[PDB]
Each structure stands twice: as C-alpha cells, then as structure tokens.
Design a protein around this ligand. Structure first.
Ligand SMILES: Nc1nc2c(ncn2[C@@H]2O[C@H](COP(=O)(O)OP(=O)(O)OP(=O)(O)O)[C@@H](O)[C@H]2O)c(=O)[nH]1
Ligand SMILES: Nc1nc2c(ncn2[C@@H]2O[C@H](COP(=O)(O)OP(=O)(O)OP(=O)(O)O)[C@@H](O)[C@H]2O)c(=O)[nH]1
Ligand SMILES: [Mg+2]
Ligand SMILES: [Mg+2]
Ligand SMILES: [Mg+2]
Ligand SMILES: [Mg+2]
Ligand SMILES: [Mg+2]
Ligand SMILES: [Mg+2]
Ligand SMILES: [Mg+2]
Ligand SMILES: [Mg+2]
Ligand SMILES: [Mg+2]
Ligand SMILES: [Mg+2]
Ligand SMILES: [Mg+2]
Ligand SMILES: [Mg+2]
Ligand SMILES: [Mg+2]
Ligand SMILES: [Mg+2]
Ligand SMILES: [Mg+2]
Ligand SMILES: [Mg+2]
Ligand SMILES: [Mg+2]
Ligand SMILES: [Mg+2]
Ligand SMILES: [Mg+2]
Ligand SMILES: [Mg+2]
Ligand SMILES: [Mg+2]
Ligand SMILES: [Mg+2]
Ligand SMILES: [Mg+2]
Ligand SMILES: [Mg+2]
Ligand SMILES: [Mg+2]
Ligand SMILES: [Mg+2]
Ligand SMILES: [Mg+2]
Ligand SMILES: [Mg+2]
Ligand SMILES: [Mg+2]
Ligand SMILES: [Mg+2]
Ligand SMILES: [Mg+2]
Ligand SMILES: [Mg+2]
Ligand SMILES: [Mg+2]
Ligand SMILES: [Mg+2]
Ligand SMILES: [Mg+2]
Ligand SMILES: [Mg+2]
Ligand SMILES: [Mg+2]
Ligand SMILES: [Mg+2]
Ligand SMILES: [Mg+2]
Ligand SMILES: [Mg+2]
Ligand SMILES: [Mg+2]
Ligand SMILES: [Mg+2]
Ligand SMILES: [Mg+2]
Ligand SMILES: [Mg+2]
Ligand SMILES: [Mg+2]
Lengths: 120, 401, 109, 37
RNA sequence: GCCUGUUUACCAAAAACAUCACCUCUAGCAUCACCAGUAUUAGAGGCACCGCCUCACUUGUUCCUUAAAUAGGGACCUGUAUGGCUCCACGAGGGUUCAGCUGUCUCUUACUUUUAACCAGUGAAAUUGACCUGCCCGUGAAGAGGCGGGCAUAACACAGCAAGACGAGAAGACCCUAUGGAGCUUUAAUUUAUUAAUGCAAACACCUGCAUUAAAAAUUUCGGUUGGGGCGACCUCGGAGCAGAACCCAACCUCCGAGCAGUACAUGCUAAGACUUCACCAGUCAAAGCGAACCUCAAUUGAUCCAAUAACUUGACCAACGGAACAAGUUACCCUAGGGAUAACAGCGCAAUCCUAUUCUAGAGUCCAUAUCAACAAUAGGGUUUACGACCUCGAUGUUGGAUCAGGACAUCCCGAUGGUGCAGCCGCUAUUAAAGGUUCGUUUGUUCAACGAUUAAAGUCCUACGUGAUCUGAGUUCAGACCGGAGUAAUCCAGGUCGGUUUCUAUCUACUUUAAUUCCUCCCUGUACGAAAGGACAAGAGAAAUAAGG
RNA sequence: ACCCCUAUACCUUCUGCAUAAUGAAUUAACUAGAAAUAACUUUGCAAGGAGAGCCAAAGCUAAGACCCCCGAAACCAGACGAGCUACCUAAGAACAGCUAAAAGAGCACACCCGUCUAUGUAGCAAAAUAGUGGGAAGAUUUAUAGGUAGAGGCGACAAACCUACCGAGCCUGGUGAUAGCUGGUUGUCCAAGAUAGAAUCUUAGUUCAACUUUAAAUUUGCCCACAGAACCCUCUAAAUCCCCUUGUAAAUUUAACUGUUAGUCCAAAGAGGAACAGCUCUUUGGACACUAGGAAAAAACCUUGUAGAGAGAGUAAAAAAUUUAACACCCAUAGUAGGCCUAAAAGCAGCCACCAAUUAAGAAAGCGUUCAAGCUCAACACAAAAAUCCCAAACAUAUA
C-alpha cells in the first residue's frame, strides 16, 4: 500500500561538505525560508495538497516567507519535493516602517530595502 | 500415487502375476485377494449374482480398499460402470494396470509416444467421464456456431490427437529405419532377444555382451526401449543383440502393437532368441502368449521359423539351458548362436590362400572375421580360415584376382 | 466446502487513548482477550471491556502482574516461571482530576 | 499483474528514469594507467 | 405407412391425422341432439386392412454391391426389451440401384425472345446527421475515408462489379434480465362460486338452506447469488488468516465451528456515563442507589402483525435465517420491454494448452551427443488448436461446409542453387537460400476432416469475419410438423438417430474493371560413371507432350 | 476563395464513443415538471393570530417557492363478426374421351389441389406466374340460403381455421391500464458539486448511511512534539491511531433537500487464476469520467491546473541506447605388459600402490584398441520468423 513517507532524521543532518557547498554556517542559522512551489500538487496525495494549501503555496513560482522553526520545517519536509527552499537574506537588515514600501525580493533571495530602479 | 488394491481374480499363478503387476507400480499394495469362479466370463457382471453379492459386501466391508484390480484382459464400459457403482471404488483391469506401469516407466520420447498410442483406447473409453466437468449445459439452443455438439467436438479432438500421435510414430519409424541403415550396410548380424515379461532378456544380454551399463530391474516391463548392444561370439564375430519389450498374456494386442514402430527392429533382425522362463510354472502359456504376440506383430515367417530358444533361470530348477545371473550355459548358447548366425546371415566359413603382400591380409581382417591364419613362408603366403559373407567374398575376389 | 467466516469486525480496541479526559462510566477500551489490564479507577465488564470508574485522564503503563491466588492457571504459570522473572502487563489508569468535593459555608449559626 | 512476474515487468516511467539516473558511474582515472610507466 | 383419403390458407403433404377391421368402457331408455332410434343399438375411446403368433432391438465378425462406399442390402455372434411378426397392392413419402438418357458435368459455345443500353413520353421505393466521401501501416470503444506517420491526388460524366461503407430492411426470433406477460401440464398455493351425487334440516318426489364427496374448472405464482445462464453449491451467526501495528475491509477465497449445554433462582428493581458490526432495527458494558447475601461458554438466534393466557408470559430449522399468512413445472406455439450491463459466431487480451527454434551433453544412433534424434530441464519466438476474459457489436457483425474468385506469410510439398551425411550409384534424411510458377480426379459421408481407388514432380502448413451468402448453394446444425431411444405424472425436454422445412435487396459513396511461363516424359550420354552383385547416375544434346498466358 | 498551420459532427448511453453503439434527409408548426407536510424569505398582528371551526410555552395569518412526455405484450365488461375459413342443415349443379365393368378401379380433359424446380420477393399477386405433378364417379368439387361466436365455436389434432397479422378474433369502454425497462425531456449567465457501507424475492430498483447543495448557530477544524496503544509468536513492513505547538481557516451543530449507490486504468500490499489476460476480488494513493502541454494517434502514464484580450516573456514534462567469438609451436626413449584382476585385459573394464631411469615423461588427462598396436596431452629442449505495403526524411566532427 502507498502510505505517507517517514523521512529518516539522518537526511536532515548537514555535513561539513554540505555547508561548504551551499554556503551556510551551522551556527547562526537563518531565520526565514523563502519557499516557492515549483511542482504541481496534481497527481500527488491529498495530504501533500493540504500541506501546500496550509503553507499558502497554491500559486507556483510565488515566493512565500516562512519561519525556520521545527513545525514549519516538518510541513516543509512533508512537501519538500514540490517546493524550492532558500534562506531569506537581509543585506540591509529588516525593513523599517519608512522603507516598507521600497522593498524587493531579488532572485538571489535578498530582500533589498531600497529599490531605486537606477544603474549602480 | 498410493493405491490399496483388492485383487479380484475371476476363474474359469495368475494371482501371483497380477500381484507382481500391482507391485510394479511403486505405490500400489495388494491388501486383499479374492479368487472367484464363474461360468460366464462375458456379461455385464462377470460373476453370477450369487458370487457378485458376496464380492460386493466383502469389498464394501473392507475399508482399506482404494481400488479393485479385476484380472481380466479388458472390461467393457457397462461392466466397468456396474462394478464401480456396486463396489463404490475405482475398478482397474489388466489393460489399465499395464498401461499405468507403461506410462510410469516410459522415459524416452519414443516410449512416451508409443504408450500414448497405447492409451488412446483408454481415453476413448473414459471420454464421457473426462469431459463431464466441461459440459456446462450449452447446446441445441444456441442458434449460431458449428453444428458439432459437445460430445462430437470432444470426439473430434480425441481423433485429432490420435492422428497427431500416429503421424509422429510414422516419423519415428522412418527415423528408426534411417538408424538401421548403417548396421545393415556393414552386415552386423542382429539377434533380437524376445520373450515373456520378466523372463531375463536384459540379464541375458548383459551376460552375453559383458556391458555394465545394462541394469536388469526386478519389476515387470523394465525395458521399454528397443536397444542394440554389441557382443563377441567364440568365432570372434561381433553380433548385435537387440533388447526388446517383454510380452504379457491376457492383454489386448493393441497395447503391444502400439510399440511396433520401435519393435520393427525385430523384423529386420537376422535371428530371434526366445528367452523361456523355464522355472516359471506357466512357461507353456508364456510361450503361447509370446508366439501369438509375435504373429500379431507380423514378424517374417522365415525368422519366426528359425527362432532359437534358450531356457533361462535354469538355476532355480535339443535346446540350451542357461542361467543369466549365474552364467552357466552361456558358452554353449554362444556356440549355437554362432552356428545360427552362420546359417542365417549367409556367412561362409572357408579357408582362403592369400599372397603375404598387397595388404590382402589386412583387408581380410577389416572386412571379415579371420578365425585363424596358418602361414607358409616357403611360398610366402598364408591360408586364413575366415568367416566371410557373400558380399565380402565378392569384393575380395574382384579386388585381388 | 468452506462455509461461514462472514462475521464482521467487532469494532473493538481502545476508545480513549492516553491523555484523553474521561468521565465516569465511559468505556476506555473493548477487547476480546485481556490485552490491556484494568488499573487504578478502571473497572472490567463481563465482556472484558475497560470503563472509567472515575472522572480523569487515561494513562497507560507497564506494571508487574500478580494474579489472584485462586487464578489457578496464572498461579501455575508463575510456579513454572524461573526465579528472578517478573511478568508485566499493560494497565489502564484513570488519574482523577476533580476532588471528591469541597467544604462550603452553608449557614452562619 | 503480481509484484513477482515470470517476465521482467515494465517499470513505471518515473521508476525507469530513477534507475537510469542512479546508474553506477565508474571512476575515470584521468590518464589511462595502461600507457603510464 | 395396409390401402383411397385429411392436414399446418401464406416456409413442413409426411412416417403425422383419419381409415375399413379388431379391442376396451358406459348406457335398459322415448316427444328439440343421441332419435322420431332401443344391446346385432347409441355414445366415449385405443390401435390400425387381412393372415400368423403372443419373438423383436442391441455387442462384434463376415458376405454381396463399387476400382474405391461413414451409402445400400444379407447373414451369423453377444446382451436388452395380448402387443410382436407378416409388404399383397398402393405412395409427388425417405434411402439404394441396372440400363437408357441427356449441357448436370469434363467445358462451355452459338442463336432467338425478354431483359438490357441509347432516343421520346410518363414517372416510384427503401435509404439519407453533414460530407469538399482516397491507399498503406500504426493507433483507438480493441476490425478507420475522417486520428498519427507516409504515399497518392486537375474536374467531371456513362456502363459494369460487389471487397468495404461493421451496407438497407425489420427497437435480434438465439441467450440473459424484468418481483413484465400469456399458452399448456400438474400429486404448485387457494377455492367450489357451477354442476353431479349423497346426508341432515324444511315441506309434506320437486324446490329451498346447510354440510360432505367428485367432476369440472377459476385466480395466482414459479426466490436470489452466480466469471453469461443451467447443473452443482450457498443464503443466518461466531473464531483465525488474507487484513503483521487504532478501527474498517471482497471473494462460488483458505480453515474451523453454532443453532446448545451446564450451574444457580436477587439469572431482583432501578440508574449516571459510555460502546456499537460502518444506516435503522437490534446488540453490548456499567458507577451510584433500593433490596439482598457476607452467572460459565465466541456464536448457541427471529422483528411487526396475529394467535393462546386472568395476568405474567409462550408461539415459526418464518434456515431464501430484516421474516410475502397461504402458490410448482414447461414453452422449439411463444409474446413484450430491454441488455453487448450478459451468452452463442466473429474480432480482440492471454498463451495455460498447442506449434516452432536454440542451450545443456544424459541417453539412443554397433563405437560416436550434434548424419538423424533426444529425457530431466533452460531460454526464446508464433498466435493456426483446446480454453479462459467478457472489451465493440443483441433499434441484427446472417452460422458450418461447398461453388466462384482468390490476396498474403514462409515455418518449402514440387521445380531452382548449396553444405553435411550412417552421401559407392539410385532412392533418400537433414540443414541454408529461394514464395516467380504449381500444388489432380473420384467412392462413402453436409463433411471441414477421415478411410479407400487411381495418379502426380507435389497433391505443403497457415492467415485472410474459421476470406468470400447486397455473387451462389443450403445437405448438416438451428424455429414452427412428425416419429424412434431415454427423462418426466404430464406439459414438455434430451452433449442420442432421422424425414420435411420462405436465402430479400433496383448500388448513393469507396475500391476496382485490357500490367520474357513452367513442368513432366522418351532417346542419347549409358546399361556408361558407381557398385561384389543386385541396381543404376549425373552434366551437355535431341524429340515429344501437358498446363498457363496471348491470339 | 482555395492553397499554409490547427481541428476525431451532435444527442443519448457508457468505466470509456470519431466510433464500424442509438436517433436524426431537411424546412414550418405542434410536442413534455401538476403538489402537499415541514422548512426558507417577505408582510400584518402579537401572548395572541385567523372573517366561527384551527393553531399557540412567539406564535399565528397571508403571500412567494415546491415534484414531466411517449411506448408495451397484457387483463376484464359489453357489442360485432361463420359473404373468408372449420364443420353442419335444406334443396341444387358438374364430372369429356379411352380401358374396364355395378369398382372410395387405371390412363386422362374440364374441375379441385399444390409435389418439385425456375422466376418473382415494394412482385401481376400482402402467396402469383411457367413448367412439372396428385386426385379427377367420389370420404369428390361447387353455386345458393341458413346454423354453431370467443371461459366460445369448429377441428379425418396441424394447438388447424374462425374476414389478409388466432397459444386464442375484432371494435368500443375501464384506459392517459402498468412498465424498477428504452427513448425524449425546449432561454442566457455564474457558482458549489465524483466519497466508505448496510438491508432488501435484492443487486437493471429503493430506504437508511456516506458524500454533495443551500441557509443558520456556535467554536474549534485540519497539519500534528513528546508520552502512549499485546501477548499468543523466536524475528518481522510501509505505516496507522492519539496528539500540544506551529502553519492555516475551517470544523461541528441546527433546518431543508435532492442526486450519486451496474466504474475504468496506473503505482503499491495482497487473494483467485496459470507468479495469463485490456481478467476477477479487497486495501492505500493517483488520474480519468473537466482545461491545457507532452508520450505518434491516445480517458487512466508524465507536466499543469480557476478560467478574459495581447502580433510580449521565463519555463514545466518532453528526442533511446546499443555491434558482440582467430590463435599456440615443437616433442616423446623408457624400469614393464606395476601388481591383483581376469581368456587377456598391456597408461588406459574394475581395486590397490602410484614409486622410478634418462637433463627431460602421469604406473597416464582424453581418443583408440577383444587384447595389443597406433594418436594426442602433460614433460624436456627454443540468434530467430506470419500473413494488404518497409515505414517521416535524414544526419557520426562549429564550442550547453
Ligand atoms: N534366479 C535367477 N533370476 C534371473 C535369472 N535371469 C534373470 N533373472 C531375474 O529375472 C528378472 C528379469 O529382469 P530383466 O532381465 O531386466 O528383465 P527382462 O527380461 O528385460 O524383462 P522386462 O523386465 O519385462 O523388460 C530379474 O529379477 C533378474 O535378476 C537367472 O538365471 N536366475
Ligand atoms: N411470532 C409467531 N407468529 C406466528 C408463529 N406461527 C404463526 N404465527 C403467526 O401466524 C402467521 C403464519 O400463519 P400460518 O402459516 O397460517 O400459521 P400456522 O400456525 O402454520 O397455521 P394457522 O393456524 O392455520 O394460521 C405469522 O406470520 C404470524 O402472524 C410463530 O411461531 N411465531
Ligand atoms: Mg528388459
Ligand atoms: Mg472474518
Ligand atoms: Mg398412407
Ligand atoms: Mg394419397
Ligand atoms: Mg376437413
Ligand atoms: Mg404451409
Ligand atoms: Mg388445404
Ligand atoms: Mg408444401
Ligand atoms: Mg396413424
Ligand atoms: Mg451417391
Ligand atoms: Mg427515358
Ligand atoms: Mg486499422
Ligand atoms: Mg458508377
Ligand atoms: Mg447487382
Ligand atoms: Mg463511417
Ligand atoms: Mg445492417
Ligand atoms: Mg432489442
Ligand atoms: Mg426462447
Ligand atoms: Mg409477474
Ligand atoms: Mg453505529
Ligand atoms: Mg435476507
Ligand atoms: Mg418441435
Ligand atoms: Mg422482443
Ligand atoms: Mg468469442
Ligand atoms: Mg461487454
Ligand atoms: Mg469486468
Ligand atoms: Mg444500426
Ligand atoms: Mg526459408
Ligand atoms: Mg436443410
Ligand atoms: Mg418434400
Ligand atoms: Mg434435416
Ligand atoms: Mg441472395
Ligand atoms: Mg453512429
Ligand atoms: Mg443499444
Ligand atoms: Mg438510420
Ligand atoms: Mg357459409
Ligand atoms: Mg368419366
Ligand atoms: Mg378413382
Ligand atoms: Mg400433434
Ligand atoms: Mg406442437
Ligand atoms: Mg383476423
Ligand atoms: Mg406511462
Ligand atoms: Mg465550478
Ligand atoms: Mg492561471
Ligand atoms: Mg607436449
């Protein structure tokens, strides 16, 4: 019978080689995930459909910010084959009230708080 | 597989023969014997009602009886049906039992084909019972399809199977002729060893040839394949003994005649050797049975006339008494076989003077059996006493004038 | 040749898993054999069903098994047990939540 | 069709792709050792 | 079948019905049949003249008939079974046959008339979703003009053809289903309203009322599951696997069981809260309290209504077990509504079965696995058998064979080339290549097949809707009639045998309609090569024919 | 205009239809959802409402909304039918010629019938024509009038015939019979919407459940952290239940309803079959019964889904790979034919030992010998095939 898959915990224990490859320090982990649905929930189990709806990833290629916490991570583990997860980067820090209207999420995963649309 | 059988022998030795037949099955055990006399062998019930009721009550009272072996050549369909209904167990006759042992022992494709031909009558007899589970009540109301009914279709299929078997057996006969071509061309004398079942044909051939691969079994109908083994006679002549299938009495002729494809090697034999089991109480009946079986097989009349006889199993107790296992009269038997092959194959034992040069002596060695060579060095020649066939003599006369 | 075997499932098993608030009289688990044994504040019916004798929380534990001395089969099993061996069984417990009652001032005589 | 078949059962195309992608790749020894001293 | 006769008007004319004759049963009597009659009469029947009796049919062997016979006729041989033998005459009855006859046929041709084609007049029918209506392969709701890949391709008439348009025609007659019909039979259920008898009443035999017994009928039914339906088995309840771990899970799936028993008489009454066989019904557990002492077992059963009882309570192997209060068979005499939800033919899936090829090197082959085979087995290929599945078609895909015409594959039967040989030669066997061409006529039987006769160079294996019924035939099968054998009480039925039995269609579309030959035999080589003999060649050459094509 | 590219009529039915499953030639006209209970919405009045009766523990009054068409074979009642046909009644008629002789006689006209063949099959004909054939003085044929009427008649029984269609006539009426069966069910637009089973003379249907829809009330619904859920059985699967947080916004309950309860393939765990089936049966999940792209065409495989216009753009899945078999050369004396074994068995039929000479040779690893002999070897020396006709065309080398 086809059932829900229990991912062994060893899969989610990064190695030093993984750290070097993907550029992430085990200490000081990132706070937020940018998650984009890159796969259709069609032809996938209803539980994956429901998890996608819960995470609010109904539209494909639409980034969504999520907490990097154990429960959200469990849901993302359930639907990990349909999504792309990246760490949200804040080169200029968190947006403030003043610059809340000038933000932009660049394809690199950086939320720039000044968007001038002018040459550097 | 496993069968406990009650041996019901009608009467008008044979019990011992039927017991041996049962034992041959390797899983069939005789658990009861009933010799019952009757004056009407041909009837729906072979026995008069007085004996029939006693047999029925005895059989049904005995619970170990899985089947009954009626020592009759072949029981008709009504007789089988009535006996089955009365005795509440399966009924087997000589035909069925012999057919079963033939099927069990048959190992070669030729033997399997021949026993299938032998079975064909059994399949025809049991057609109704073998197809009763396929009727499904379909016929005469379904308005389309071939006009053949269920039984007509089954009979057609059985006939087609029999035709296939007969075609295959004809091909086998052709192939056997092809195989015999070479031995016939090189003029090997052929002696076909025939006789009653279990009379010692295989053992005698083993004793004569000296082969060790020959395995004379204790069970009946051990040899189901016609096979040729070479041996040497006192005259240094090589003779080919053909071991054949044994014959049984009170058995349908068709069963054995189904083996004619492989038994035709007997017809092309130069001599026939009847192995009489003299120790057996019914040796005379065995002789009658085997002679009738050979006549049915249509062996050449000259060959049947020239048939030699050897009394095997003489140790247990005009001809040559022999003991195959002990090996008592083998040398004598070989002497008479030598004489018989000389007078049958048209081989002349003659002295022949040859110049000791030109390879005439080597030619004579290779194309004839040089019994002896007396050499005259003064004339530089040799007189060879040799057993030479007519063809070899003609070849020599032309080659070396 | 094979007749019968058409009986449906008894729908037996645990009705209240651990941590479930249970009111007095609730059936905790229905069983054909003694899978879970009665614990504190848990009663057994004629058909071996476990019902809550008090209002509280269901807890499943593993506790040593000491049959009644008149339970001949269990006593024989124990008599045949090697020294040092202790049987264990799963027991169902109801940890009562509310107190039996409170003392209230009813009249200031 | 049962899980165990007398013949090699056809794999679901995704399983076939998985098996093709997870095939053994031998280590290529850069310069062929045969023609090195 | 005695005969002459009768019959299903419109598919059966007969062996069926009748029939003289014979036999069985009933009836002792008149004013509307019988009958204006009276036991030698009348009616209801059976069978079938007469004659002889109270032997016939089945199991095998054989003879005649044919060249050849599953045909026809005649014998003998085994067992079954006062209604059995006997064919005189007769028969559009069913088989066999001598002789003759003949276009039945080998083998078809010529002519005349009709029809036909063109001209003139008059002028339908079914059919028709629209069509701007091609071929191949593949695909697919399992068989494409329309889809995919190729190929082909100016437009049109006219005359032919019948391979397809699963062609037109009839809402398939076969098969299944429907709590759909009807006919018939019954020892199916329920009745005797109606008659005929009696008996008791009423009246002084008849009539009336009430009962009983028969005949006659009447009303109604004839369960379900089901690898189609039938047969068989099963139908309710519980335990265990399948279903390993909360629950739940099908099977005409594998196995076990139950329709109680035993002990007690608080096996009393009440009452929170829960469980629950996936609904409901029903079934379960139970604190506390009153009252008392100080229930085992898995199933172990059944509702409502209605009966018995004063009441409490009890009542169906209602087992088709959620239970109609009480109803069976058969239909080919059948009918209606449907079903390709479901069978028969076909196609299609599959390849158990079947066929074929390689591998092993046991065993046959005198020795020798491999000239030819080949056990135990292994690996492959085919889709011709017997099956299974029920996917298209039941507002029809007409059915086995044969005629006619044949298309295709090669796994080649012959002719061609080649290797091996247990190839001396001739015959052969085996294998590679070769599908241009060819692959007979007859007796029996519907035979496709099979047996037999005579031939041939051979009389190949298959597929093509078991190719080909809008080209033909209907002998069988397979309607309605009728017998013989068997089953049943009967209707009627039967994988038994048989005699008879309506073969529609004027072509709209597609497609098509004038495209260097093989073989046998005779002679010679040559009675040569070869061979001990027997027997007996190739190659090359000459001549004769036959078939096929074209004239 | 065509040529270019894309595009498998519609309806019904079905698991699934371009389907070679049904219907339809086409135009015009006609042709098919009737209604209570309880609910919902809107008013009036209100512990009362209503124009007597009835209801009322906010009810009550009124209104709005709310349920099709055609089709059987049948059954019964009353009429009508014997100008056809079955039989009968009355009184009539016909039957050449020849042979025979008082004939259910023979041949054979008229006449009656209809054996066989051909034609015809919307025909000349709703049963005929031509030939052929049976009877043709009788149980014959036939004209006329009359009679027997359907729970019936009549019948030389063929379940025949009874006014063209008799397993039981025809007409009218009950009657718009009934049909769990088939077919049909007519304006526009949007939205939600495929989902376990039980019982059933029941599996072609229906009621309940489940699912689905609408409106309303309320608060938890889904995902899920530990902890927790059995021994039998020695070991043992994917998982499941429960479940705070967390991410989400749904869930339960109340009121009122229909419709679906004859289903297909794929992945997986299994059962039956034959570890066959596009086979059948359960379980988990997916897809299809809805759009689109791809796998050639394509319901079930892969990608992808929430919908419009655009002559913009980035992508998703998405194109098969393979080509396979050479091989040693030289050389061999010999204890002895090692014993036993056997007629002999000599390296080689079998058993025991298997030493030993020449630099170099197994008391012999395969052939071969009846036995020998002769041959070597070891040792020195230096993949496939089926039937209409293969199937895009091609291409190895221009920088992912
Ligand atoms: N006492 C004894 N027995 C013997 C003799 N010859 C043969 N036998 C036995 O007879 C039986 C015959 O066996 P085979 O020789 O294989 O038989 P066959 O003659 O081939 O006959 P089938 O078994 O029918 O083929 C065996 O038990 C032999 O041992 C003899 O001389 N004496
Ligand atoms: N509960 C119950 N009712 C019964 C039983 N027997 C009969 N009945 C009732 O009677 C009906 C059956 O009628 P019948 O079959 O005629 O009964 P019977 O006792 O065999 O015969 P009668 O007395 O002639 O009716 C049922 O449906 C009930 O109404 C029974 O055993 N139990
Ligand atoms: Mg033998
Ligand atoms: Mg069970
Ligand atoms: Mg007659
Ligand atoms: Mg007559
Ligand atoms: Mg008449
Ligand atoms: Mg007729
Ligand atoms: Mg008539
Ligand atoms: Mg007729
Ligand atoms: Mg008669
Ligand atoms: Mg004939
Ligand atoms: Mg004209
Ligand atoms: Mg096609
Ligand atoms: Mg034309
Ligand atoms: Mg025509
Ligand atoms: Mg078409
Ligand atoms: Mg048609
Ligand atoms: Mg129909
Ligand atoms: Mg019928
Ligand atoms: Mg009915
Ligand atoms: Mg419940
Ligand atoms: Mg029931
Ligand atoms: Mg009939
Ligand atoms: Mg009908
Ligand atoms: Mg079929
Ligand atoms: Mg179907
Ligand atoms: Mg199916
Ligand atoms: Mg049609
Ligand atoms: Mg070939
Ligand atoms: Mg016919
Ligand atoms: Mg006739
Ligand atoms: Mg017939
Ligand atoms: Mg025709
Ligand atoms: Mg159509
Ligand atoms: Mg239809
Ligand atoms: Mg039409
Ligand atoms: Mg009249
Ligand atoms: Mg006259
Ligand atoms: Mg006359
Ligand atoms: Mg009759
Ligand atoms: Mg009849
Ligand atoms: Mg009429
Ligand atoms: Mg109606
Ligand atoms: Mg929608
Ligand atoms: Mg979108
Ligand atoms: Mg060497």
């Amino acid at each position: 019978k086809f059932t829900r898959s229990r991912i062994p915990e060893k899969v989610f224990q990064a190695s030093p080689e993984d750290h070097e490859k993907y550029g992430g320090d085990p200490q000081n982990p990132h706070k937020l995930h940018i998650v984009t649905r890159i796969k259709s929930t069609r032809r996938r189990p209803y539980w994956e459909k429901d998890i996608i709806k819960m995470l609010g990833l109904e539209k494909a290629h639409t980034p969504q910010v999520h907490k990097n916490i154990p429960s959200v991570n469990a849901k993302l583990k359930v639907v990990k084959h349909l999504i792309r997860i990246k760490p949200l980067k804040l080169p200029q820090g968190l947006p403030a009230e003043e610059n809340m209207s000038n933000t932009c999420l660049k394809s690199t995963g950086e939320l720039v708080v000044q968007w001038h649309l002018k040459p550097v | 597989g496993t069968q406990r059988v009650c041996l019901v022998h009608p009467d008008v030795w044979q019990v011992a023969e039927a017991t041996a037949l049962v034992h041959t099955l390797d899983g069939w055990s005789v658990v009861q014997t009933m010799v019952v006399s009757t004056k009407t062998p041909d009837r729906k019930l072979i026995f008069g009602k007085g004996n029939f009721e006693h047999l029925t009550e005895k059989i049904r009272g005995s619970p170990d009886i899985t089947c009954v072996f009626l020592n009759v050549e072949r029981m008709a369909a009504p007789t089988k049906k009535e006996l089955e209904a009365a005795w509440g167990v399966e009924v087997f006759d000589r035909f069925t039992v012999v057919l079963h042992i033939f099927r069990c022992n048959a190992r070669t494709k030729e033997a399997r084909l021949q026993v299938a031909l032998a079975e064909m009558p059994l399949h025809r007899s049991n057609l109704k019972r073998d197809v009763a589970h396929l009727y499904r009540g379909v016929g005469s109301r379904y308005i389309m399809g071939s006009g053949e009914s269920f039984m007509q279709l089954q009979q057609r299929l059985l006939r087609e199977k029999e035709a296939k078997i007969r075609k295959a057996l004809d091909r086998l006969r052709k192939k056997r002729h092809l195989l015999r071509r070479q031995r016939t061309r090189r003029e090997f004398p052929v002696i076909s060893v025939v006789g009653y079942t279990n009379c010692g044909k295989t053992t005698l051939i083993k004793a004569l040839t000296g082969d060790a691969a020959i395995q004379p079994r204790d069970q009946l109908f051990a040899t189901l394949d016609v096979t040729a083994h070479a041996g040497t006679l006192p005259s240094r002549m090589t003779v080919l003994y053909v071991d054949t299938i044994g014959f049984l009495s009170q058995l349908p002729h068709g069963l054995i005649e189904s083996f004619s494809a492989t038994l035709e090697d007997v017809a092309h034999s130069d001599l026939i050797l009847h192995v009489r089991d003299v120790s057996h109480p019914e040796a005379e009946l065995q002789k009658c049975s085997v002679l009738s079986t050979l006549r049915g097989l249509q062996l050449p009349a000259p060959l049947l006339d020239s048939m030699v006889e050897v009394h095997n199993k003489v140790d247990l107790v005009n001809v040559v008494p022999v003991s195959a296992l002990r090996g008592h009269g083998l040398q004598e038997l070989k002497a008479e076989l030598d004489a018989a092959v000389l007078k049958a194959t048209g081989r002349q034992i003659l002295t022949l003077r040859v110049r000791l040069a030109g390879a005439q002596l080597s030619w004579l060695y290779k194309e004839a059996t040089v019994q002896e060579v007396d050499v005259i060095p003064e004339d530089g020649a040799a007189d060879v006493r040799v057993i030479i066939s007519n063809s070899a003599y003609g070849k020599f006369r032309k080659l070396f004038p | 040749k094979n007749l019968g075997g058409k009986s449906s499932g008894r729908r037996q098993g645990i009705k209240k898993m651990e941590g479930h608030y249970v009111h007095a009289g609730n059936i905790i688990a229905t069983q054909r054999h003694f899978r879970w044994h009665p614990g504190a504040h848990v009663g057994v019916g004629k058909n071996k069903c476990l019902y809550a004798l008090e209002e509280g929380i269901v807890r499943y534990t593993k506790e040593v098994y000491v049959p009644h001395p008149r339970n001949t089969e269990a006593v024989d099993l124990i008599t045949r047990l090697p020294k040092g061996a202790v049987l264990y069984k799963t027991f169902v417990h109801v940890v009562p939540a509310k107190p039996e009652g409170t003392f209230k001032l009813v009249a200031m005589l | 069709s049962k899980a165990v078949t007398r013949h090699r059962r056809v794999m679901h195309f995704q399983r076939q792709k998985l098996m093709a992608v997870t095939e053994y790749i031998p280590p290529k020894p850069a310069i062929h050792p045969s023609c090195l001293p």
